[PDB]
Structures are given as structure tokens and as C-alpha cells.
mmCIF file of C-alpha atoms in Angstrom:
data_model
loop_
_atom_site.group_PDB
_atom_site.id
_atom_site.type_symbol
_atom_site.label_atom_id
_atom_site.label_comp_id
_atom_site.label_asym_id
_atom_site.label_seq_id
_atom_site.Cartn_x
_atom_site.Cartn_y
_atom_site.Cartn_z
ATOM 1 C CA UNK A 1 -10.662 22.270 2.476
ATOM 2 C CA UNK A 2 -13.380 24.606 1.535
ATOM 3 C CA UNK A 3 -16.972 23.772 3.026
ATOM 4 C CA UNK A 4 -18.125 23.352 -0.684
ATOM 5 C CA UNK A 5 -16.726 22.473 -4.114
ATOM 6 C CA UNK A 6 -18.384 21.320 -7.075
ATOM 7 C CA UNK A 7 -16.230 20.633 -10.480
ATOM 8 C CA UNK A 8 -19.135 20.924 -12.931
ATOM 9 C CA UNK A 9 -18.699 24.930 -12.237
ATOM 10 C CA UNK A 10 -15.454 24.377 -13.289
ATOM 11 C CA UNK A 11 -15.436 22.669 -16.286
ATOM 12 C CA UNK A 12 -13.824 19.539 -15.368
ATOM 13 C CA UNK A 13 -17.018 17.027 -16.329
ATOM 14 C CA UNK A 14 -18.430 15.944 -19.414
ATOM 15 C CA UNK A 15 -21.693 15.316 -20.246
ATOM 16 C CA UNK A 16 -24.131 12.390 -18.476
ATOM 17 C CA UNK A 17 -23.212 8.955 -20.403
ATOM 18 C CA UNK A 18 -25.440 5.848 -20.438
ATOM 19 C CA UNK A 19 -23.442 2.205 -19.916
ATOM 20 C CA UNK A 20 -26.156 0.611 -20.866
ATOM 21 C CA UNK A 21 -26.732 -3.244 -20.014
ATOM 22 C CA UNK A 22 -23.036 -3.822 -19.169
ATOM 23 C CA UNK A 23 -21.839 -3.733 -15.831
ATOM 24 C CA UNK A 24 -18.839 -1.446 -17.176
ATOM 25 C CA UNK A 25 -19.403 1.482 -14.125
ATOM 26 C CA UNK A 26 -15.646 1.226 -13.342
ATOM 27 C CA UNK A 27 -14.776 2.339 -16.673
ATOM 28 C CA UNK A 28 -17.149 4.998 -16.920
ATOM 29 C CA UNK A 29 -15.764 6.064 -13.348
ATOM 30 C CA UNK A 30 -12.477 6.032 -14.175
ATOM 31 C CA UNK A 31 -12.925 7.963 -17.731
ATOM 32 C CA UNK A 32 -14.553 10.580 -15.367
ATOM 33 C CA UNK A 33 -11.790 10.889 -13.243
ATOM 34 C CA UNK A 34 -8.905 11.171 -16.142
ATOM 35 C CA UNK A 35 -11.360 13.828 -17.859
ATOM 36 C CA UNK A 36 -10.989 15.730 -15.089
ATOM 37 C CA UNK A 37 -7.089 15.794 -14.571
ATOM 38 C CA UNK A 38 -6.787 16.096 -18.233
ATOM 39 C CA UNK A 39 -9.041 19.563 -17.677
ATOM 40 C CA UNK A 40 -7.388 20.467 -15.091
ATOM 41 C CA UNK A 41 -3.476 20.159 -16.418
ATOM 42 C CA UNK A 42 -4.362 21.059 -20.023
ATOM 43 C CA UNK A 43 -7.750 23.369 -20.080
ATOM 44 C CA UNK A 44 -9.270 20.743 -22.714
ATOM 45 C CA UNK A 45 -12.181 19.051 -21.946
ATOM 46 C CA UNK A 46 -12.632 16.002 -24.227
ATOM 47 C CA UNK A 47 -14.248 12.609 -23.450
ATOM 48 C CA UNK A 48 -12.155 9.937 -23.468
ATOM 49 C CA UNK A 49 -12.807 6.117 -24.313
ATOM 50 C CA UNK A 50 -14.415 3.668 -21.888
ATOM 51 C CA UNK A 51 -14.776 0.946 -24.351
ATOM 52 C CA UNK A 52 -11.096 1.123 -24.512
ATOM 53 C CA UNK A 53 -10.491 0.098 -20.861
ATOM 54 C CA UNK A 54 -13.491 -2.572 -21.191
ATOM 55 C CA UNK A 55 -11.890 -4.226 -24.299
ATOM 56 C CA UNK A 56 -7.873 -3.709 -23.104
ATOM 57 C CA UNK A 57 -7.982 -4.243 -19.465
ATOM 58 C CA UNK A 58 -7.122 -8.022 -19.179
ATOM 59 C CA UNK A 59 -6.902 -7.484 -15.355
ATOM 60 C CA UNK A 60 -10.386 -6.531 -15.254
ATOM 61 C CA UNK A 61 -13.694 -8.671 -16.452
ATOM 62 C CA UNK A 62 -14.498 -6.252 -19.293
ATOM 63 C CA UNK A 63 -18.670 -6.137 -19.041
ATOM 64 C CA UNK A 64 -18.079 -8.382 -15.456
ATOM 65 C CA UNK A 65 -16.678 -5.609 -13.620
ATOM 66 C CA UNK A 66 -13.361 -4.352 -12.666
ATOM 67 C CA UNK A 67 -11.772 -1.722 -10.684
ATOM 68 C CA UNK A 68 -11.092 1.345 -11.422
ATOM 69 C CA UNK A 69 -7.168 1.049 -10.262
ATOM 70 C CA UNK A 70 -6.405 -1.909 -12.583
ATOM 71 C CA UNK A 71 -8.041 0.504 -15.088
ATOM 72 C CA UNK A 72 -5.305 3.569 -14.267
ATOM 73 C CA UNK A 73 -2.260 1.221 -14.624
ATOM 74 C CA UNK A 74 -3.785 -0.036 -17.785
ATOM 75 C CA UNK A 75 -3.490 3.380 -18.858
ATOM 76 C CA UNK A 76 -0.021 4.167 -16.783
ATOM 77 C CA UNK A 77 1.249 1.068 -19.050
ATOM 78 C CA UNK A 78 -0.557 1.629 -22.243
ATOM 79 C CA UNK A 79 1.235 4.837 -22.742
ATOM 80 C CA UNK A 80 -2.634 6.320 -22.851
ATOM 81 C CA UNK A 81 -6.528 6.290 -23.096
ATOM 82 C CA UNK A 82 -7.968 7.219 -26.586
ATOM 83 C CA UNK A 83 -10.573 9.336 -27.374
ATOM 84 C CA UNK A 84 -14.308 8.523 -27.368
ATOM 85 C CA UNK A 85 -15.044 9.227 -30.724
ATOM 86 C CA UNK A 86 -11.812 7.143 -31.444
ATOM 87 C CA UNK A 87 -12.636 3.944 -29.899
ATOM 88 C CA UNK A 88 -16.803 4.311 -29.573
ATOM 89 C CA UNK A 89 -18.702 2.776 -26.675
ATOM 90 C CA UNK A 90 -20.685 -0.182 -27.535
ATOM 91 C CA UNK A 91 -22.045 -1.249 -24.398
ATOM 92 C CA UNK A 92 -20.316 -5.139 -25.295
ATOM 93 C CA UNK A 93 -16.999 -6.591 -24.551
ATOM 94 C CA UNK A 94 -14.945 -6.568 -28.053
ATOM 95 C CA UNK A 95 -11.443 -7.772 -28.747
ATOM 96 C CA UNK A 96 -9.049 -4.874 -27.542
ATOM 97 C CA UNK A 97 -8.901 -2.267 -30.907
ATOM 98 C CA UNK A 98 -6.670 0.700 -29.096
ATOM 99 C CA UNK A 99 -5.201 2.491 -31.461
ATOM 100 C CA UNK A 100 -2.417 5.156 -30.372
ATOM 101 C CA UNK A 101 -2.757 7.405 -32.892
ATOM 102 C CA UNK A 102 -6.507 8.529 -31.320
ATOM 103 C CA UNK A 103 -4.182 8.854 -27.882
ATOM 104 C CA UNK A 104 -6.313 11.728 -25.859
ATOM 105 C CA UNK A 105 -4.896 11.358 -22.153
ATOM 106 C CA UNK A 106 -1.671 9.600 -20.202
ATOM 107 C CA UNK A 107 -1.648 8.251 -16.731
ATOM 108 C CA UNK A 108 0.841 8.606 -14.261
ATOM 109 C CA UNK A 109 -0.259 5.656 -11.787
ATOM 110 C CA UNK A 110 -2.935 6.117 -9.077
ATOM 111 C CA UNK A 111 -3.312 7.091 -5.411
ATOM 112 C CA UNK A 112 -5.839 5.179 -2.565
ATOM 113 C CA UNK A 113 -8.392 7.123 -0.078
ATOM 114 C CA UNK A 114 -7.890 5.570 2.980
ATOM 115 C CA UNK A 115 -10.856 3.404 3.365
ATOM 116 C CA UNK A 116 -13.633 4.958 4.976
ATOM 117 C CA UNK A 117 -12.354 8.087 5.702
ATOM 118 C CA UNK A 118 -14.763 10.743 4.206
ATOM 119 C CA UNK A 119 -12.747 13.557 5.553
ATOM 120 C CA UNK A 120 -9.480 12.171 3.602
ATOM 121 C CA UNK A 121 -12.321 11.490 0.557
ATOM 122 C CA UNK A 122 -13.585 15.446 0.905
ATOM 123 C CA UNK A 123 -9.627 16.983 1.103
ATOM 124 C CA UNK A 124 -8.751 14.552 -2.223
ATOM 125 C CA UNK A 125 -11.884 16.086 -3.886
ATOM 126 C CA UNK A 126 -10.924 19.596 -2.685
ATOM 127 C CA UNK A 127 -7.236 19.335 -4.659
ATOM 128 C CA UNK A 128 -7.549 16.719 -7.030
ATOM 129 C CA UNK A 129 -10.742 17.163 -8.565
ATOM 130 C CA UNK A 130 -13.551 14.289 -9.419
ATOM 131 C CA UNK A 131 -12.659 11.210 -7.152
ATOM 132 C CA UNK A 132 -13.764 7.633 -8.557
ATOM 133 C CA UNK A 133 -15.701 6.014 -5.812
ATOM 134 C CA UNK A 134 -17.732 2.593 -5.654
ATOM 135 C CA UNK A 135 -21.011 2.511 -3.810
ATOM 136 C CA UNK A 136 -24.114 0.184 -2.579
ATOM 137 C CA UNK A 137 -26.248 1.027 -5.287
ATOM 138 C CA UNK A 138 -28.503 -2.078 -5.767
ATOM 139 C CA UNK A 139 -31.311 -0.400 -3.252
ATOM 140 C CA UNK A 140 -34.920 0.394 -4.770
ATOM 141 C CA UNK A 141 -34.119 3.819 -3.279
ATOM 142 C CA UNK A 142 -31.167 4.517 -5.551
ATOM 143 C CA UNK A 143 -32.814 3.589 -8.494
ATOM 144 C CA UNK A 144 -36.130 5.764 -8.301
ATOM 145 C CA UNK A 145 -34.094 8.456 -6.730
ATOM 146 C CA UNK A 146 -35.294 12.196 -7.735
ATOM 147 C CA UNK A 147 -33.967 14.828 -5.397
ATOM 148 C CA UNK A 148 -32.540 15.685 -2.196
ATOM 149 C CA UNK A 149 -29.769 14.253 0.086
ATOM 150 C CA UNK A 150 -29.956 10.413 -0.587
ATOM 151 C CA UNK A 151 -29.922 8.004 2.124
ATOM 152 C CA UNK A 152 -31.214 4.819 2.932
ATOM 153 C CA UNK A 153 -30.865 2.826 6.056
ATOM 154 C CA UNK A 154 -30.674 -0.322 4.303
ATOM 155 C CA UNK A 155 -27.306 0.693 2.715
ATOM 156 C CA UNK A 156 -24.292 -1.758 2.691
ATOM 157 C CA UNK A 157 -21.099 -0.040 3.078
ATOM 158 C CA UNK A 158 -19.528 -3.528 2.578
ATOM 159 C CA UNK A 159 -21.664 -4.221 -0.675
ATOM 160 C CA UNK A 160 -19.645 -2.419 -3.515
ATOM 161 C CA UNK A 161 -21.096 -2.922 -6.680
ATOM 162 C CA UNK A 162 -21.600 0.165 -8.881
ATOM 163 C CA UNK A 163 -19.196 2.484 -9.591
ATOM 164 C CA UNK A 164 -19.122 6.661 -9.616
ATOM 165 C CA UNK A 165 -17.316 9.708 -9.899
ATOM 166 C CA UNK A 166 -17.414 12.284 -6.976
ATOM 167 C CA UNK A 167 -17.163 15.981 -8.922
ATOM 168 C CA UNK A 168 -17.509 17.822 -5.203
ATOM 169 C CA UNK A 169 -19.779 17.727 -1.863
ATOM 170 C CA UNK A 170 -21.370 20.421 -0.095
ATOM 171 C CA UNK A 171 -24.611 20.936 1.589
ATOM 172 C CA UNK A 172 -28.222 21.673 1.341
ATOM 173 C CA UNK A 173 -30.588 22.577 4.294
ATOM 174 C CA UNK A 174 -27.709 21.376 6.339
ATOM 175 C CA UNK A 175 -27.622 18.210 5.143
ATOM 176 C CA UNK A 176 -23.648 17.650 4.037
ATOM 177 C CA UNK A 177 -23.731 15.462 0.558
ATOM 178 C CA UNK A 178 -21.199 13.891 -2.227
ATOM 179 C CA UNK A 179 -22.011 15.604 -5.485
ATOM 180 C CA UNK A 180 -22.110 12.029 -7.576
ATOM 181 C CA UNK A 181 -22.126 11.741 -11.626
ATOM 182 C CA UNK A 182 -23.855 7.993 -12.565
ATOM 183 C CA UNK A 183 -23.783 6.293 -15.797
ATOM 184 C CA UNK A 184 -27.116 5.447 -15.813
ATOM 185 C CA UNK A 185 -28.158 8.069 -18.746
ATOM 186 C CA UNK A 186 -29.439 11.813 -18.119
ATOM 187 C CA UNK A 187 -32.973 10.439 -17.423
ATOM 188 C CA UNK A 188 -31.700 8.919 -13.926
ATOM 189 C CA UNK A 189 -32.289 10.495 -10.759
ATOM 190 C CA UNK A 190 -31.673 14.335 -11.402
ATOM 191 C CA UNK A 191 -30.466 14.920 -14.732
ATOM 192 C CA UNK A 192 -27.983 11.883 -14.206
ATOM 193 C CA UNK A 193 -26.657 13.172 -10.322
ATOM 194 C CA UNK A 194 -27.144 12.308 -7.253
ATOM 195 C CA UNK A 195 -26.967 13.398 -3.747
ATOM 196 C CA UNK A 196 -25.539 11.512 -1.275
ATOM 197 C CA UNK A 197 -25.052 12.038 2.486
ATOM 198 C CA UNK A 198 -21.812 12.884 3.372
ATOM 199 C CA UNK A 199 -20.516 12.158 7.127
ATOM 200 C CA UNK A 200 -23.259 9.883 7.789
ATOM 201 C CA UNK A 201 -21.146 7.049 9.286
ATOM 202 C CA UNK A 202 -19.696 6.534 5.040
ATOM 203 C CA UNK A 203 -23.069 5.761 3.815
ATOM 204 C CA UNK A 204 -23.282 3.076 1.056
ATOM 205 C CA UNK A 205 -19.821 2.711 1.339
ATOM 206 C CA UNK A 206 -18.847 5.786 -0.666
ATOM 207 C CA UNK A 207 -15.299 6.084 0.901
ATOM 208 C CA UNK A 208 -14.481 2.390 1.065
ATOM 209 C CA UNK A 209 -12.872 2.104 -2.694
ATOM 210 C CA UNK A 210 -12.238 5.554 -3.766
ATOM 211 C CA UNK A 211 -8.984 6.507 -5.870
ATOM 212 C CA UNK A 212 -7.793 8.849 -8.318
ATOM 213 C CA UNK A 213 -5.155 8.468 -11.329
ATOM 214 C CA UNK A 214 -1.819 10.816 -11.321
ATOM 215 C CA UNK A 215 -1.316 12.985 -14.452
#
């Protein structure tokens, strides 16, 4: 795998998106992650529905949280996602509304990291494209973070609770990082990223829940 990737370059990731109150990360992870395949096997770059896997996916807890696997098979089974400007984000669990005709993207299934392997993390990033991970996020660090390589002693790698997409990794000043894209709005940390260290003993967690959907 190359010592640097970042999808953005490529056109595989939409714009910064805002969840709002609801603790619906998952779904904005996993919308991230079928954006990107759909890129990447048709060339069209659309954003695709996460109010439709909050209100749909029964095996998750809608606004409560979910994961982003149970969120692919919804998909798998559904026969598809729909569009974002077909089923609107609302930022509050409604009964399920999918309609087929606003159909945008189809999932094949799913595939598992291995948990807490970053180097089996970095080679899925390097030919898949953006990974959906699940981090410690709940630290006063990662919520007033700005720039740089992020890291924070105080990380849990066994305290999952926020949900991401990893659109690459590389390395600045020699400090190897995850390229991460939050739902937290553009205002958040830089422009909406983050940095976070890479090969640092899986730092926060980052490889402990990380998958990707087949297309």
C-alpha cells in the first residue's frame, strides 16, 4: 500500500454534513462509505440518505445508535439507499418513508477489519476507498480540536461511541495519521477533518470496529 492516500483528491467524498443533536454518526459513516464505492464503480458522486437508514434500520436504535454493518445489510436487503434530497435529513427518528423510486446506491453485503489491526485498516483504505470506523471521541481534546496529528493519552480504545469515515492516512512532520471526515458540521475541528495518529498502539480505538459495504 502506498505510504499516502487521501480520497478527497479523488473525488470520492461529499461535502462536511452536520447530524445535529442525534446520535445518528453510524449513519452518517456508513452514507460516507457507500458514497464512496458508488464514486468509485460509477464516476457519480451524489449524497445519499442517512435519514433513510435512521428511520428503516429496525436492527439499529435510529437516533440511539447503531452500527454501521446492520446499516449495510439494511441496504444489501432493501434492494438500496435513496438519495439525500429524496429522503431529507431531519436530525429526528421518523417512521421509515423509503421510497424506491429515489433509489441512488445498492449494497452488496459488508466486509470486517480485523480488530485492531491498523495495518489491515491502512491496506482496506488503500483499495477500497473511505473505511467506516468508530472511535473514542467523548474527550475535551476531540471536541476543541484545530490542527495537527490528534492524540490524547486519555483515549479509550475500548470506549466506541462516535462514528467516522476514514477517506486516507498519511503523514505530516513524521507523524503517520488517519485522514477522518466527522459529522459534526464544517465549523468542527478543521473544516470538519481531523487528524488522527496512526500506528500509535490503535489510538481511540480507530481500528477496533471498522468495515466497509461491497458494491
Amino acid at each position: 500500500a502506498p505510504d499516502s492516500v487521501d480520497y478527497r483528491k479523488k473525488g470520492y467524498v461529499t461535502p462536511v454534513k452536520n447530524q445535529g443533536q442525534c446520535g445518528s454518526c453510524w449513519a452518517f459513516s456508513s452514507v460516507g462509505a457507500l458514497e464512496g464505492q458508488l464514486k468509485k464503480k460509477t464516476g457519480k458522486l451524489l449524497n445519499l440518505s442517512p435519514q433513510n437508514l435512521v428511520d428503516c434500520v429496525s436492527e439499529n436504535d435510529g437516533c440511539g445508535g447503531g452500527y454501521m454493518t446492520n446499516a449495510f445489510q439494511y441496504v444489501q436487503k432493501n434492494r438500496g439507499i435513496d438519495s439525500e434530497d429524496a429522503y431529507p435529513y431531519v436530525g429526528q427518528e421518523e417512521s421509515c418513508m423509503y421510497n424506491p423510486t429515489g433509489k441512488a446506491a445498492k449494497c452488496r453485503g459488508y466486509r470486517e477489519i480485523p480488530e485492531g489491526n491498523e495495518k489491515a485498516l491502512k491496506r482496506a483504505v488503500a483499495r477500497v476507498g473511505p473505511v467506516s470506523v468508530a472511535i473514542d471521541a467523548s474527550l475535551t481534546s476531540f471536541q476543541f480540536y484545530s490542527k495537527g496529528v490528534y492524540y490524547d493519552e486519555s483515549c479509550n480504545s475500548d470506549n466506541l461511541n462516535h462514528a467516522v469515515l476514514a477517506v486516507g492516512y498519511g503523514i505530516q512532520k513524521g507523524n503517520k495519521h488517519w485522514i477522518i471526515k466527522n459529522s459534526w458540521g464544517e465549523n468542527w475541528g478543521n473544516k470538519g477533518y481531523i487528524l488522527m495518529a496512526r500506528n500509535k498502539n490503535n489510538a481511540c480505538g480507530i481500528a477496533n470496529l471498522a468495515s466497509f459495504p461491497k458494491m
